[PDB]
Structure 1
Amino acid sequence: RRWFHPNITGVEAENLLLTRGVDGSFLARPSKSNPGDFTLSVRRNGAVTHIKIQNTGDYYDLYGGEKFATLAELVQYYMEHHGQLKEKNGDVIELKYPLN
């Protein structure tokens, strides 16, 4: 981290990204809907997008795409490789600026 926030909700992440973030700000947090797992909260166009991270026990990924041994390697990969996450239509979801 410090893009990793161990004790926030999706709501609390929204509030943080909206008040202390800029467009391209992001963080990872524990998932509500999958206990024990993680979710990326990403600000783009003044709003927040959430994306689940899968942990299979053998790797992490985004329920698709490249496989990683650790959450930090996942985050680094998508920070370094811009334009790998997209809406189907067709703007990019960029992890630009960790929110620490």
Structure 2
Amino acid sequence: GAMGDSEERSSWYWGRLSRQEAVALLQGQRHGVFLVRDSSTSPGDYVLSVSENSRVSHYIINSSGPRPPVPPSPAQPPPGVSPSRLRIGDQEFDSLPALLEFYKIHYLDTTTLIEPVSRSRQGR
């Protein structure tokens, strides 16, 4: 056995990988493996890459996570305990593991989700 969790980011996270770089290794290895790219341009977003039918699709995930509190009412004191919010493409979730787990067995666009793509660029 070996590592392989959904909550562990160090398990389904590698780093920044361009389109050619991400695909170079994510060239549809297993029946269907997904990989998380380390976005850059974005001020604080995450890019998700999915492999299927020998392809590689990229999806940008938004993470509102508003640090500063903002009351919905015109007159009211700002709270302290506020949960984070994460949205991907045209769907919303609780966190990275929330969508990854809910889609770990369900289709996100035109395919399901399976174990993460090898951490290395070589099949061992």
TM range (shorter): 0.7 to 0.9
CA 1:94–1:35 in structure 2 vs 1: closer, same or farther (change >3 Å)?
A: farther
Contact 1:25 1:42 in 2 (8 A): yes
Tell me whether 1:31 sits opposite 2:39 in the alignment: yes
Q: How does 1:75-86 map to 2 (within 5 A)?
A: 75-80=100-105, 82-83=106-107, 85-86=108-109
- Equivalenced residues, count: 91
Tell me whether 1:59 sits opposite 2:85 in the alignment: yes
User: Per-residue CA shift, 1:1-20, capped at 9, x if unaligned?
Assistant: 3221123333321111117x
Considering only aligned residues, what root-mean-square deviation do their CA atoms show, in Å?
A: 2.1
CA 1:24–1:74 in structure 2 vs 1: closer, same or farther (change >3 Å)?
A: same
Tell me whether 1:96 sits opposite 2:114 in the alignment: yes
Q: What is the TM-score normalised by the length of structure 2?
A: 0.61
Structure 1: state its 5+ residue gaps. Answer: 87-91
The structure carrying a bigger helix percent of its residues is 1
Contact 1:6 1:30 in 2 (8 A): yes
Seq. identity, %: 33
Tell me whether 1:14 sits opposite 2:14 in the alignment: no
- Match in the other structure for 1:48: 56
- Match in the other structure for 2:14: 5
The structure carrying a bigger strand percent of its residues is 1
Q: What secondary structure is seen at the aligned counterpart in 1 of 2:44?
A: coil
Q: What is the TM-score normalised by the length of structure 1?
A: 0.74
**Structure 1 residue identity aligned to 2:12:** W
Structure 2: state its 5+ residue gaps. Answer: 1-8, 66-83, 120-124
Higher RCO (CA 8 Å, separation ≥ 6 residues): 1
CA distance in 2, matches of 1:47, 1:7: 19
